[PDB]
Amino acid sequence: QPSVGDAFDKYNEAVKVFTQLSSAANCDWPACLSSLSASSAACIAAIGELGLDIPLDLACAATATTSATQACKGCLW
Amino acid sequence: PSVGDAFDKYNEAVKVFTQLSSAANCDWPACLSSLSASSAACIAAIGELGLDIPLDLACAATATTSATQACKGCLW
Hints:
Two copies of one chain form a homodimer. The first copy, chain A, is built from four helices and no strands.
């Protein structure tokens, strides 16, 4: 089988790349998260950390039907 | 789109991992409990019975090690 360890490494690398690029951008995570139309555990956790947890921000954003909100400019698109 | 492309690759890594986990005999709830990690991602992932793959991965990334038998097929 394809290595699940490698796939986990690639997940961690994708989070790192996003974290490096997102830190350099004009992202307001609490505003972005609140703008999302997302009812999910990931969003409860992400909003609960005031957007400070980038992995939870990403998991939350993936559960929303809308990602291209004005408040999420600089964060997700 | 700098962050937009990076978010797309994040989603691809999660989607690939999701399909790969089903084929690898992974017991996510057992794996999560074996990590003994009480980070926010882990509490949320455990409450979701391991069904939320993005939170499973975020939880695993907060653990000190993935070296448990319950995480064979999930993380190694």
